[PDB]
Design a binder for these strands. Structure first.
Lengths: 454, 229, 171, 74, 59, 102
RNA sequence: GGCCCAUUCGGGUCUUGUAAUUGGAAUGAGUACAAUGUAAAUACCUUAACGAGGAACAAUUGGAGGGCAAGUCUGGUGCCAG
RNA sequence: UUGCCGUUGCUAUGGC
């Protein structure tokens, strides 16, 4: 048995490498490095923070105050929020408008404050990739990001620019182009409690910036498709996911190194695993992330998977195969064009062309026990991760959001044992990158806010 | 050109620092330059470790002793004034100098193996140790290889640990150098391989010499604190 | 490298003619170098076939050899057998160099345009500008071959000929 | 007043034949002897050029009804 | 440019070697210091003159 | 615009000093510009501009980053005491020439 | 009109040539600001300015074959052979 | 509660 001989010889090999618990167990170099550890400074940014907010089953779920404030902007795309240590929120749309909200009036719907709308006036007079230093967006703003301190919001989209606006007036303070032709930005994330931005640009590139210095730190390379989502916490690590290469990478940005995590679910072995006694299959494209803590994260796929990954395992720890359902099959009055229902039913091939909803938004509350998933099934899902950190489980649903969920994130309130949050979710009737979405089933372009309690 | 005990990285230089003469031997000590500069790294080069030696931060065995190649051997408590650094350095299990950090009431003393008791001149009993502290007047029952406890403010013996069957012993020398556990066996031969034998995690057995072993306390209660992992 | 056995037979001359013309090579030393180390590779894989199944050398060095050949990129992911290392040959190795790859990705119009782009530093894989044409890109650096951002074919400031013509036409 | 040396005393290329600009580069010579070779290959074989370009105009060069350019067995 | 010093050094040596036998001595004098040349360089120049092993000519 | 990143900041009370490694970031600039770097370091930390010092600069290939070794003092007088004389000649105020003979 | 085969007659094939004109891009050797490095200096690394049309900013070495004069030499059965 | 437009509430919904 050749793989048995491989495992056996590898075991003998590791035993021989060990060859080349007592009462005294102290090692001189380890305790010397621990003396240097006692000598050093800056136990602030580099907390390898584990899950210290265990509250998944604690708070209420089923009776949230859900207000779906519809807004008149075609296809809202992103949502950025802010809390100091009054709270503002930000939305941005495919109609080239950024909009500031106040959200701190917690028991009611948010309040519009200020527009900032680019348009055809901001097309540059050059068509030349480094004099892209205009003051507004002329194409398809895809992402906003508020500063952790709140001086600025920074936004960008398919016009390959980063425009950083002031908070108090929504004015463009600085323009930083991405200096090449395909340099469309797709996701932005500040590292927490900082002034450092991580943008993920479709050149298979990740750009980093210091916003209050108007400088770019480091460009870091290495995905294989467009870097569709990004996520960061207080550590200088980052977690990006490229779309169709089906890998999620995490980046030690000062070292400029990474850990890659591929997928790897196969319907052959999965249907055999069920065949030991079923509509589930392989993977299209890993789409969204959120780093839950500094040892784990969660990925949202294109076949409706939500997966939970550790920092110490290439293959994922936990899967959840169907997370928002399978799409309604196309009707017999809109598949075939024959006359009889028998042939128009034969043109469905049974179950072979039922496609699942793909999770287009995922948000893990940082270091907490609970994350929120959203797609165009109409109902957001709330999941909590078990305390042994090897599984998660569906708590409840938030069914007042008709449309695609282009963004989810939460806003905190309450103290250490009694808490209430408003879950913002940007709702559109069209995916945040291309159109591709038919059967617009009662959708509206709005902000689904929910107020969850206890 | 280095020994094994110093935990000295090879990418350092060409000439290795010979320790000067002092209390301990050359083969069982580390100087202050290899202590401060390239082990716990309070310096970067010989110039600035000489600078802090001229500033006189070091207080090994309660005296200053400003010297670069001063041979700190076994359990000389290195004392540094800034950030109240108290360091008792002992042997680890694989031959190096593990420098444990201790506190002030433990660095207020040390212990020492007695080597010989003499009727030297004028009726004065007499005792020496590995740093050579010729202190006056112990009890008559000081055999060889017992353990005195030095005062470190004056020089007097304060406590005494008798060497017998059933004592916690430290081995510094030969192929057992730096082991603790002190009980499987006792065997005093008549000129070599004579010792008390030391256990392991599975309570294995070991052979050493008398002079290459010296007592540190009792079965569970040494008043020295020890590092762990 | 090392010269072949019969270096002047007409099949070898037409071989080197087709190789140097189809891949834009400068002399025979490119073919001879890459073929010398390919000879070492499949001379090793021949011995790995001449030993038997469940041999430790065969198991470990065989999957090691085919995995680092797949990661160089001359061998595809699905053929994980050791006889494909014998079926491997020299243009499978010099299709992997950066001049060939720049032309195939279409940043250049021919292999000679690719060679002069590379030697004039308009091409950077990943982070670093590569400037020698025989580079042997890998399967992960295959998709980050793009124009350098320090170059006018990227988005940078235009070169001396363009700016001197602009200045003289401004005069 | 400095009688500087000139190029024929400096480089000392005494009495050479006329040589080739294509020989002054080893790469361009193999670019232009491969273009010559693959223009000669159209003479010996018939080279697949890429299929039908536009409308089928005709054979453009002639059709021989007497010649059969096919390999007979044994 | 010590680089161009070394480059022109080599080029002069080779062009001198095509005019005299291949392996004649080209000597390098540095800048003049106090009216005349450095005496180290003139010392080993005289060391080169002192061993020359003349061969008899015809005229 | 240059950018600054300190890493692995330890304190040396024996030398009255705080030392760290310096990732200096200059996209589309030449290099570190060490006096301007001492200015930027002396303003990100506290004032002591004749007590902040950097010495070990290595720029990686293609530019952008350079790793240096940063050590910052309190008390400019004890910085003059503890720093070596060649770095004092390079940056600060000291200048003693060696006697040129033999 | 080029090319290919063949001892011969001949055969096979096809956009191929030209010191023809011409166009704007590219940059590298070189010349050089620096800063970095280093006891100091060199070098590596980073890098503004200039730097191509005979791109004369002028790579070789060896081989195969011609052709020409109011020219010269030799032979001898005109005008030829060498 | 918005680009319009409808039911509107004296606030929620649904068609482009």
């Amino acid at each position: 048995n050749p793989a048995d001989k491989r495992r056996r010889l590898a075991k003998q090999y590791l035993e021989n490498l060990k060859s080349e618990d007592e009462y005294n167990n102290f090692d001189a170099g380890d305790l010397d490095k621990d003396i240097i550890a006692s000598r050093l400074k800056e136990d602030v940014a580099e907390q390898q923070g584990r899950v210290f907010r265990y509250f998944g089953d604690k708070l209420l779920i089923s009776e949230a105050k859900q207000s779906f404030t519809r807004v008149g902007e075609n296809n809202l795309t992103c949502i950025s929020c802010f809390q100091p240590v009054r709270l503002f929120a930000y939305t941005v749309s495919k109609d080239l408008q950024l909009t500031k909200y106040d959200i701190t009036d917690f028991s009611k719907r948010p309040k519009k404050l200020k527009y900032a709308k680019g348009g055809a006036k901001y097309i540059p007079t050059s068509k030349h990739e480094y004099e892209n230093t205009t003051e507004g967006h002329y194409d398809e703003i895809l992402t906003v990001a508020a500063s952790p301190d709140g001086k600025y919001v920074v936004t960008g989209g398919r016009d390959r620019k980063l425009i950083v606006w002031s908070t108090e007036s929504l004015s463009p303070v600085k323009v930083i182009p991405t200096k090449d032709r395909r340099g469309e930005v797709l996701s932005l994330a500040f590292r927490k409690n900082s002034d450092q931005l991580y943008a993920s640009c479709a050149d298979f590139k990740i750009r980093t910036y210091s916003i209050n210095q108007f400088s770019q730190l480091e460009i870091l390379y290495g995905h294989h498709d467009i870097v569709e989502d990004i996520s960061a916490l207080a550590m200088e690590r980052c977690v990006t996911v490229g779309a169709r290469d089906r890998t999620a990478m995490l980046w030690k940005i000062p070292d400029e190194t990474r850990l890659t995590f591929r997928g790897g679910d196969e319907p052959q072995k999965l249907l055999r695993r069920w065949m030991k006694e079923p509509l589930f299959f392989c993977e299209g494209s890993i789409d969204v992330v959120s780093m839950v803590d500094d040892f784990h994260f969660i990925t949202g796929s294109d076949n409706g998977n939500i997966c939970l990954w550790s920092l110490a395992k290439k293959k994922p720890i936990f899967t959840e195969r169907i997370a928002h359902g399978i799409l309604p099959e196309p009707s017999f009055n809109d598949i075939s064009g024959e006359t009889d229902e028998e042939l128009r039913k034969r043109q469905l091939q049974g179950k072979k062309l039922l496609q699942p909803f793909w999770i287009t938004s995922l948000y893990a509350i940082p270091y907490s026990n609970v994350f929120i998933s959203g797609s165009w099934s109409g109902s957001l899902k709330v999941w909590k991760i078990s305390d042994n950190l090897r599984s998660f489980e569906l708590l409840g649903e938030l069914s007042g959001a008709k449309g695609v969920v282009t963004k989810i994130q939460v806003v905190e309130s309450g103290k250490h044992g009694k808490e209430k949050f408003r879950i913002l979710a940007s709702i559109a009737k069209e995916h945040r990158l291309g159109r591709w979405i038919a059967n617009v089933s009662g959708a509206r372009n709005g902000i689904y806010s929910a107020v969850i309690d206890q | 050109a280095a020994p094994h005990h110093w935990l000295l990285d090879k990418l350092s230089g060409c000439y290795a620092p010979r320790p000067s003469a002092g209390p301990h031997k050359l083969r069982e000590s580390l100087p202050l330059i290899v202590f401060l500069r390239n082990r716990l790294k309070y310096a970067l080069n010989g110039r600035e470790v000489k600078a802090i030696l001229m500033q006189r931060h070091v207080k090994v065995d309660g005296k200053v002793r400003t010297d670069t190649t001063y041979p700190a051997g076994f359990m000389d408590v290195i004392t540094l004034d800034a950030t109240n650094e108290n360091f008792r350095l002992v042997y680890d299990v694989k031959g190096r100098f593990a420098v444990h950090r201790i506190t002030d009431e433990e660095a207020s003393y040390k212990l020492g193996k007695v080597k010989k008791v003499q009727l030297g001149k004028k009726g004065v009993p007499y005792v020496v140790t590995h740093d050579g502290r010729t202190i006056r007047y112990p009890d008559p029952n000081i055999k060889v290889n017992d353990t005195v406890k030095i005062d470190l403010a004056s020089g007097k013996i304060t406590d005494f640990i008798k060497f017998d069957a059933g004592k916690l012993v430290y081995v510094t020398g030969g192929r057992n150098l730096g082991r603790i556990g002190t009980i499987v066996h006792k065997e005093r031969h008549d000129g070599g391989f004579d010792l008390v034998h030391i256990k392991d995690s599975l309570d294995n057995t070991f052979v050493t010499r008398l002079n290459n072993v010296f007592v540190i306390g009792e079965q569970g209660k040494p008043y020295i604190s020890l590092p762990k992992g | 490298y090392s010269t072949p056995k019969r270096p002047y037979e007409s099949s070898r001359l037409d071989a080197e003619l087709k190789l140097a013309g189809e891949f834009g090579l400068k002399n025979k030393k490119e073919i001879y170098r890459i073929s010398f180390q390919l000879s070492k590779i499949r001379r090793a894989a021949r011995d790995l076939l001449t030993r038997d199944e469940k041999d430790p050398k065969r198991l470990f060095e065989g999957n090691a050899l085919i995995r680092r050949l797949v990661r160089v990129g001359v061998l595809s992911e699905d053929k994980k057998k050791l006889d494909y290392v014998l079926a491997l040959k020299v243009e499978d190795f010099l299709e992997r160099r950066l001049q060939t790859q720049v032309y195939k990705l279409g940043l250049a119009k021919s292999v000679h345009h690719a060679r002069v782009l590379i030697t004039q530093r308009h091409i950077a894989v990943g982070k670093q500008i590569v400037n020698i044409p025989s580079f042997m890109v890998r399967l992960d650096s295959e998709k980050h071959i793009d124009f350098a951002p320090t170059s006018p074919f990227g988005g940078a400031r235009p070169g001396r000929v363009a700016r001197r013509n602009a200045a003289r036409k401004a005069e | 007043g400095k009688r500087a040396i000139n190029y024929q005393i400096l480089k000392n290329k005494g009495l050479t034949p006329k040589r080739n600009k294509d020989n002054r580069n080893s790469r361009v010579k193999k670019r232009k002897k491969y273009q010559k070779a693959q223009k000669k290959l159209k003479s010996v074989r018939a080279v697949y050029s890429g299929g039908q370009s536009g409308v089928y105009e005709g054979e453009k060069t002639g059709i021989k009804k007497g010649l059969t350019r096919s390999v007979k067995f044994k | 440019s010590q680089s161009t010093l070394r480059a022109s050094k080599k080029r002069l040596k080779h062009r001198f070697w095509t005019e005299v036998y291949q392996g004649a001595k080209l000597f390098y004098l540095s800048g003049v210091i106090n009216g005349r040349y450095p005496d180290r360089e003139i010392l080993n120049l005289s060391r080169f003159i002192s061993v020359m092993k003349f061969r008899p000519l015809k005229w | 615009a240059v950018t600054i990143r300190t890493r692995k900041v330890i304190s040396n009370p024996l030398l009255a000093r705080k030392q760290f490694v310096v990732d200096v970031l200059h996209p589309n600039r030449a290099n570190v510009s060490k006096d301007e770097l001492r200015e930027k370091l002396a303003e990100v930390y506290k004032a002591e501009k004749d007590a902040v010092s950097v010495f070990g600069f290595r720029t990686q290939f293609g530019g952008g980053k350079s790793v240096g070794f940063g050590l910052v003092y309190n008390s400019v007088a004890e910085a003059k005491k503890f720093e070596p004389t060649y770095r004092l000649v390079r940056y600060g105020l000291a200048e003693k020439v060696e006697k040129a003979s033999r």
